[PDB]
Amino acid sequence: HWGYGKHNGPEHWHKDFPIANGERQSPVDIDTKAVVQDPALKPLALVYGEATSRRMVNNGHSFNVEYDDSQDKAVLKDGPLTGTYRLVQFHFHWGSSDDQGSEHTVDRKKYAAELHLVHWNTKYGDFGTAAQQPDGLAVVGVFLKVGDANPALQKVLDALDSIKTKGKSTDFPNFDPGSLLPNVLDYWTYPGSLTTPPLLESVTWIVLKEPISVSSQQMLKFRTLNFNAEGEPELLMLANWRPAQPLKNRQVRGFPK
Ligand SMILES: [Zn+2]
Numbered sequence: 001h002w003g004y005g006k007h008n009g010p011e012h013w014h015k016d017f018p019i020a021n022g023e024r025q026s027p028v029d030i031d032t033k034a035v036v037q038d039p040a041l042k043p044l045a046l047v048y049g050e051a052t053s054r055r056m057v058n059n060g061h062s063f064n065v066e067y068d069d070s071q072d073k074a075v076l077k078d079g080p081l082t083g084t085y086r087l088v089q090f091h092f093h094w095g096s097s098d099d100q101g102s103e104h105t106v107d108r109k110k111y112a113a114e115l116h117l118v119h120w121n122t123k124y125g126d127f128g129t130a131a132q133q134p135d136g137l138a139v140v141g142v143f144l145k146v147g148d149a150n151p152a153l154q155k156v157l158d159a160l161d162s163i164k165t166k167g168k169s170t171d172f173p174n175f176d177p178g179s180l181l182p183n184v185l186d187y188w189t190y191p192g193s194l195t196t197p198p199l200l201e202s203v204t205w206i207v208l209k210e211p212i213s214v215s216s217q218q219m220l221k222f223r224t225l226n227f228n229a230e231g232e233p234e235l236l237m238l239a240n241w242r243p244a245q246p247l248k249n250r251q252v253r254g255f256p257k
Pocket of ligand 1: 091092093116195
C-alpha cells in the first residue's frame with residue numbers, strides 16, 4: 001500500500017513502518033562543510049570483473065537489475081567496510097522533472113536521479129539474514145547529473161519497454177555494473193537504512209562524490225514506467241525518491257578527505 005503519491009508517500013510510511021521515524025534513516029543531506037576525515041577509511045574495492053547479471057524486473061516501486069549472488073562474483077570490499085559484500089541488484093530513483101530525483105543531496109543540491117548498488121555481508125550466509133543486522137548491507141549510491149547522453153545507461157533504458165508494468169521481467173545478461181560507476185571513487189559514508197519499506201537500519205552507505213551523466217531525453221524513459229500491473233488503470237512511475245531525513249547523532253565521513 002506504500003508509494004510516492006500524496007496519500008501513500010514518504011510522509012505516511014511511518015503508519016505501517018514506524019522505523020521510518022528512527023534514528024538512522026536514509027537518505028540524508030551531505031553537508032560538505034560537516035564531513036569528517038577518518039584514517040581508518042580505505043579506497044573502495046569494487047571487484048566486479050566476474051559480475052553476472054540475470055534479469056531486469058519492475059516490482060511496482062522501481063525496477064531492479066538482478067545479479068547472481070550465488071558465489072563471490074561481484075563483490076565490494078574495503079572502503080569503510082569489514083569483510084566481503086556481494087552485489088545482489090541495482091536500481092534507480094528519479095523525479096518528475098530533471099531538477100529533482102536524487103535521494104541523497106549534497107549541500108541541499110538535488111540531482112536528476114540516483115543509482116543504488118545493493119550488497120550484502122557474506123558473513124550472514126544470505127541477503128535476508130544480512131538485512132536485519134547493523135553491518136549487514138552496503139549500498140553504493142551514484143548521482144546522475146543531467147548533461148551528455150550515457151551509452152552504458154542507454155544499455156538499461158532500452159530494456160524498459162519490456163518491463164513497463166508491475167511484475168514484468170526480462171532477460172538482461174552480461175551487463176557490467178562497473179560501466180555505471182565514475183572513474184574516480186572518492187566517497188562519503190555514514191550508517192543508515194534502506195530508503196524503501198521496510199526501511200531497515202542495516203545499511204553502510206557509500207555515496208560517490210562524482211556523478212555519472214544522463215541526458216534529459218534519457219530521463220524521460222525512466223518516467224515511462226508504470227506503478228500498476230497490466231490490466232489495471234495506468235499510474236506512471238513519475239517519481240520514486242524519498243527526501244532527506246534527519247541526520248540525528250550521525251557523522252558523515254569522507255575519503256580521501
Ligand atoms: Zn534505492
